[PDB]
Amino acid sequence: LDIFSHRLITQYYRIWRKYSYPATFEAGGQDKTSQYLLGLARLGIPGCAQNIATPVSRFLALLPLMLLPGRTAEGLTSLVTLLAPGTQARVWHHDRRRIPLKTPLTMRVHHPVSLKSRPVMGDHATDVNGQVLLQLSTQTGSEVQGWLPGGHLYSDLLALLHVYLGSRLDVRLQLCVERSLLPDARLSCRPAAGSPQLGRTAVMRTQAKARVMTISLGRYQRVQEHYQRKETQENGDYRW
Amino acid sequence: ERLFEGFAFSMGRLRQKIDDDLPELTESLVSMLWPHYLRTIPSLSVVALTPRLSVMKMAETVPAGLEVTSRPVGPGNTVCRYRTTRAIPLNPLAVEKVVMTTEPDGRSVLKIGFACSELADWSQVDLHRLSLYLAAEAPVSSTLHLMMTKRLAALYLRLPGNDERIRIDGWFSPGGFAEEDRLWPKGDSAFSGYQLLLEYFTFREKFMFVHLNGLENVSLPAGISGFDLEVVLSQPWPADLPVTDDALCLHCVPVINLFTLEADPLIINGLESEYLLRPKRLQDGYTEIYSVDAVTGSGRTGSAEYVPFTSFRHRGGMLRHDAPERYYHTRVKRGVTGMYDTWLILETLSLRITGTNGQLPRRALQSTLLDRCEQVLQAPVSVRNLCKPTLPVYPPTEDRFHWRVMSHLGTGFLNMLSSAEVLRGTLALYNWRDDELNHRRLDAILAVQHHRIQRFEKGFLLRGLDVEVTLDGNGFAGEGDIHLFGEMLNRFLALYADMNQFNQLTLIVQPEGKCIRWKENHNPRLPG
Amino acid sequence: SVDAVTGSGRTGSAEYVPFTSFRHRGGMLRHDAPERYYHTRVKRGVTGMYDTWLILERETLSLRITGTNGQLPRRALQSTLLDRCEQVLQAPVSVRNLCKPTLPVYPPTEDRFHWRVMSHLGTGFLNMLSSAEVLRGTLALYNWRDDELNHRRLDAILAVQHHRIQRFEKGFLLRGLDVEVTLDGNGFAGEGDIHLFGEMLNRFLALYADMNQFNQLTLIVQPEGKCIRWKENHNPRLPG
Amino acid sequence: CVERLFEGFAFSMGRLRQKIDDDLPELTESLVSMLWPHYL
């Protein structure tokens, strides 16, 4: 009857573990309870993790935020703070972007443009409802290198935005730090992840003339709006 | 040996509860998000109720709920009790013949013959929207559906006197998306974007009903017996196809195995938590409680009217102040025999309870024919079963199904729906009957891609999302299933339309590279 | 609450972190990050106090713990006077209690309220502005004082409706949301209360609404037909 | 003999089952707190 006692004891401990969450953390979204939380975070469908390519368990730290229908600046601030505590950040709304036009504004007789369309000249239109600006600032070289293109903080932030903002809005990223924390632009016969970019970080060495320098980090965007329309062959056509 | 059996038996049960991991809380939440994910789906079919044509002067409406019982099925010789989910305006006409042919002009034509009653009063006959059911195998009827519904080119009414070339103004349309039936007692939720998906994957036959609209504008001479209409369609109807007089049927409707249980007087002798509800003649081993419709008794305060707790919780309002109005609530759980027991949470109460039939032999039911329809109508309508009856379909209760279900609902869910793996994974939540056809079709999803849509309106930049899905046509009954699937999928996708962005569905048929699309899904709603 | 947990052993300082803020090496799985943590659990003791349990040989831990007062007399709290403010500053400073102290407030309980658990879980799937019914219900979850007056205030919400706003600023076209709420003015002590309620609601909406969206609040006083409008935006915007 | 063993066993099974339904509210509140930190 030793097995009777053994089995009952075993079940007791399993039952105890059942309701002790910390015990089951197992350094990742491996337990059912961890997955349950991810479910509430709208990440419960298998196969979705593969579209993120990050340690998805990271998002649990943001769980209370993901329960909201909107995505506030409070969220972006949290993302930056979480990844590299010490780094400060600020968010501006209605960041302006220029949008190319499909057609120029022209004058016609048969099918003229009505002012109800609020037309603009034919080269570019403005967009102040599609982007926000996320500005970062650090107090040490370590954090700076992490934020620069090729760094691990840069990558992680984009990995999180991928899910937190998704397709809702694009984010323009820039970093404001003392010149003394930036590298001297140098050439190389071979490119590298940490190599300075012409229009973002490639600051020239100063001849022993620190002020704060604003550099670009990049831009977050999920959908590239490329062209594969394949017009149409047929369509939904029920008269009802 | 007996001690061993006892020990192992009980230990198993305990282990199972643990592995299930928290249905206790999850199910209660799910029911308030998904109003129909805590119920089984009762068996159902489509039955033709055909009146005597010879003598019928006026149209008659068959009341919804009209019952057609079955013949004895399985041990105990019990019967099923099916009832119509729609009211039917029976007209004094019937399908005489179905003939597939072709014109010298190259246009395929389907000629459908009909006949009228000797005393048909055309001022009474409801020739507004003639409901015709396609009673033929899916590999052929799915094609027929589109060929008549979307490819129609011309319609002619052939009258006696060689007057065959009478052009008729009218068209065909699907009725499977009608709001009026719903096939379930769900007139409050109206979440068509979801329900249509369960229906597509389960009782697909509901979508094989096509109405012919505009006959109200057609004047015909009085007469007796046969006449014909010609459906001219803009295609070379695929050469390989059967045709038969039994392919088309007018006088039929979907019926479901649901019936009223006796409203036995429920009495209590204290607030002993929850009470067990059970009908008389439970001993048959077949009857089962499906749902409680109403609770009203008689107490010292007069009629003891109770309010379904859910009427408060569904709103999610000040339950603190709504609950005092004598609420009631019900729960269900399988007993030791696998049958569901119903519990009541709150003097005699009259409980109005709808039931169904539970466990039974599957072959016995499949081979069972329907008995005569209750004689309510003036015409002794005959009963013809147009499709082998289904057996009860139970929802999956495994792994993390319920949590997947909750994840699915969020508006933001759309953002992860950008790959075939996810799309298949979510559609799978509705495949409660895992047959070969559904798997072949589900696995036909090869790829999913997202593209951005940008347009200016009134100086404002409008954003939207193009969801492109590539399908393997080999998993579908040709274009028929592809287009029906597509239309339904579009209606579903629209659920995720938002004030700050619209959706659009595009499908690619990979075997040909044929692209088809639907119009934009606009819905100025808050980002739930 | 526990503010910090740091111990000492043969491995030097033991840098434990709070569990609920997901641990870096634990969740992020990266180098130069700790794998030591603690969680706190509280139970009700015999005196009604909370017994704090720490969820972590002869390792020594230094616990930084903030406390408060327990079951003090109902009457005493309403008749308590204040003593001299510590004279840290060079000038003597006297004190005056400007109001009777508010006694400790506990979260609502009747039978543990499985309904409360359900209310919060349900809320996570709803937009607070979807309807008056939801708005009333959700706001009510914060009325931990069980004040009938606060009830009447919330019960005065008759209807909630919203519209899209098309507005210009600095030559740019901006999107926003018009939130209109109809109130029964008899639930408030005139304009004084209606205004302050609206001021709070306006602020809340700002913290709830999504990015690149301005929000305005309109409150209608049904008995008269007049309204109070909040048309302002405190967010940094249009940086370029 | 086995009947006596059964009753003893059933008692133990009762207690284990009861525990499953006893510690449930703990995890329940913990989960809610994790989502809404002010809850408890």
Residue numbers in the entry:
A (entry chain G): 122 to 330, 336 to 366
B (entry chain I): 47 to 392, 406 to 587
C (entry chain H): 337 to 392, 404 to 587
D (entry chain H): 45 to 84
Sentences from the paper on this structure:
To understand the architecture of the T6SS baseplate, we overexpressed and purified an EAEC complex comprising full-lengh TssF and TssG (residues 64–366) as well as the shoulder and neck domains of TssK (TssKSN, residues 1–315). The final cryoEM map has an overall resolution of 3.7 Å (3.9 Å for the TssF–TssG focused map) and is best resolved for the region corresponding to TssK, TssG, and the C-terminal domains of TssF. The cryoEM map also contains a few unassigned densities that were modeled as polyalanine chains and which likely account for the N-terminal regions of TssF and TssG. Our results show TssG acts as an adaptor interacting with two TssK trimers and two TssF protomers to form part of a baseplate wedge (which also comprises TssE). The (TssF)2–(TssG)1 complex assembles as a locally pseudo-symmetrical heterotrimer with a 2:1 stoichiometry. The N-termini of the three modeled chains form a three-helix bundle interacting with a triangular core, which is formed upon trimerization of the C-terminal domains of TssF and TssG. Loop 1 anchors a TssK trimer near the apex of the pseudo-threefold symmetrical (TssF)2–(TssG)1 C-terminal triangle, whereas loop 2 binds another TssKSN trimer at the periphery of the triangle. The two TssK trimers are tilted ~ 60° relative to each other and interact together, burying an average surface area of 1000 Å2 at their interface.
Type VI secretion systems (T6SSs) are found in a broad range of Gram-negative bacteria and transport proteins directly into recipient cells. The T6SS needle oligomerizes in the bacterial cytoplasm and comprises an inner tube, made of Hcp hexameric rings arranged with helical symmetry, surrounded by TssB–TssC rings forming the sheath. Localization of the needle within a donor cell is mediated by a pre-assembled cytoplasmic baseplate comprising TssK, TssF, TssG, TssE, VgrG, and a PAAR-repeat protein. To address this knowledge gap, we report here the 3.7 Å resolution cryoEM structure of the EAEC TssK–TssF–TssG complex.
